[PDB]
Structures are given as structure tokens and as C-alpha cells.
Enzyme design. Structure first.
Site, PDB file in Angstrom:
ATOM      1  CD  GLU A   1      13.476  -5.640  -8.532  1.00  0.00           C
ATOM      2  OE1 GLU A   1      12.488  -4.777  -8.591  1.00  0.00           O
ATOM      3  OE2 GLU A   1      13.359  -6.819  -8.370  1.00  0.00           O
TER       4      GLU A   1
ATOM      5  CG  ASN B   1       4.047  -4.225  -4.895  1.00  0.00           C
ATOM      6  OD1 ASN B   1       4.751  -3.424  -5.565  1.00  0.00           O
ATOM      7  ND2 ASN B   1       4.450  -5.359  -4.864  1.00  0.00           N
TER       8      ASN B   1
ATOM      9  CG  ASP C   1       0.556  -6.807  -1.532  1.00  0.00           C
ATOM     10  OD1 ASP C   1       1.028  -5.628  -1.723  1.00  0.00           O
ATOM     11  OD2 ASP C   1       1.071  -7.777  -0.810  1.00  0.00           O
TER      12      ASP C   1
ATOM     13  CB  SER D   1       3.046  -3.873   0.030  1.00  0.00           C
ATOM     14  OG  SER D   1       3.377  -4.617  -1.312  1.00  0.00           O
TER      15      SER D   1
ATOM     16  CG  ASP E   1       8.192  -3.319  -4.742  1.00  0.00           C
ATOM     17  OD1 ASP E   1       8.026  -4.256  -3.533  1.00  0.00           O
ATOM     18  OD2 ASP E   1       7.913  -3.873  -5.588  1.00  0.00           O
TER      19      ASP E   1
ATOM     20  CG  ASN F   1       6.682  -5.552  -0.747  1.00  0.00           C
ATOM     21  OD1 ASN F   1       5.857  -6.093   0.271  1.00  0.00           O
ATOM     22  ND2 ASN F   1       6.064  -4.825  -1.707  1.00  0.00           N
TER      23      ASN F   1
END
Length: 129
Positions: free
Chosen positions: A35, A46, A48, A50, A52, A59
Site C-alpha cells: 500500500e 482516487n 472518484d 477520494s 487514500d 480512503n
């Protein structure tokens, strides 16, 4: 903070992730490796809208508030910046909620794609834990 591998293993163990929801410590170390590369300051946007955050790339649509993600639920009740601290407490607490959400560690796509089905206990080899 960029953790060393055994350093992170010891911290995650101290905070009760070894065997949490039945996932051994090596799963959690492997997930953090892919990650974030063990970097608490990692962030990634991301598609959309959002983002991380942190060592486990948690998220902002569901879990933390970053002030710019519409439909934010903030289920961990934390600012996303708390997930970037050198102190992994907030990340661990939130990860415990996420892994309890029903799909286990499949919630972490990097875990599914790079850890699941592999020899995850290799990630804790050599460490004094």
C-alpha cells in the site's frame, strides 16, 4: 515516517493487529509494504475524488474526513491527516474497523493482489517480536 519492516511489525503487534480478525501479522506487514512502502505520509488520489492516506492507504470516502471528498461518511471519526502521523495508532484503530466490515482484508486491493495466497509470514522473518 518511513518504518523499517521489523520496526513496523513490532508496532503493529504492540497495537494488537497480530491475528486481528484472524489475520496474522505478516498479512498486515505485507499490506503496508504494497500500500505505502511503509511510509506513513503516503497519499494517493482516487478516480472518484477520494484520497487514500497513510501506511494502509485508508480512503476518505468512507473512513476519514479530508474536507474535499463528497459523500464522505467519516466512519473512523478522524481527520485523514491523523493517518499520516509517525504514530500509527489512528491508522491501526481505523484498520481494525475496516477489516471488521465484512470482506476482511479484501478491503485492501494491494493485499488481495500481492499478499493473499502468498507466504505472508516471510514479512516477519528475522524480526524479534
Amino acid at each position: 515516517k518511513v518504518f523499517g519492516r521489523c520496526e513496523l511489525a513490532a508496532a503493529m503487534k504492540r497495537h494488537g493487529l497480530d491475528n486481528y480478525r484472524g489475520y496474522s501479522l505478516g498479512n498486515w506487514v505485507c499490506a503496508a509494504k504494497f500500500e505505502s512502502n511503509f511510509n506513513t505520509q503516503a497519499t494517493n488520489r482516487n478516480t472518484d475524488g477520494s484520497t487514500d492516506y497513510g501506511i494502509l492507504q485508508i480512503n476518505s470516502r468512507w473512513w476519514c474526513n479530508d474536507g474535499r471528498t463528497p459523500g464522505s461518511r467519516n466512519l473512523c471519526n478522524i481527520p485523514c491527516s491523523a493517518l499520516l502521523s509517525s504514530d500509527i495508532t489512528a491508522s491501526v484503530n481505523c484498520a481494525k474497523k475496516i477489516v471488521s466490515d465484512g470482506n476482511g482484508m479484501n478491503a485492501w486491493v494491494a493485499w488481495r493482489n500481492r499478499c493473499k495466497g502468498t507466504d505472508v509470514q516471510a514479512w516477519i522473518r528475522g524480526c524479534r517480536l
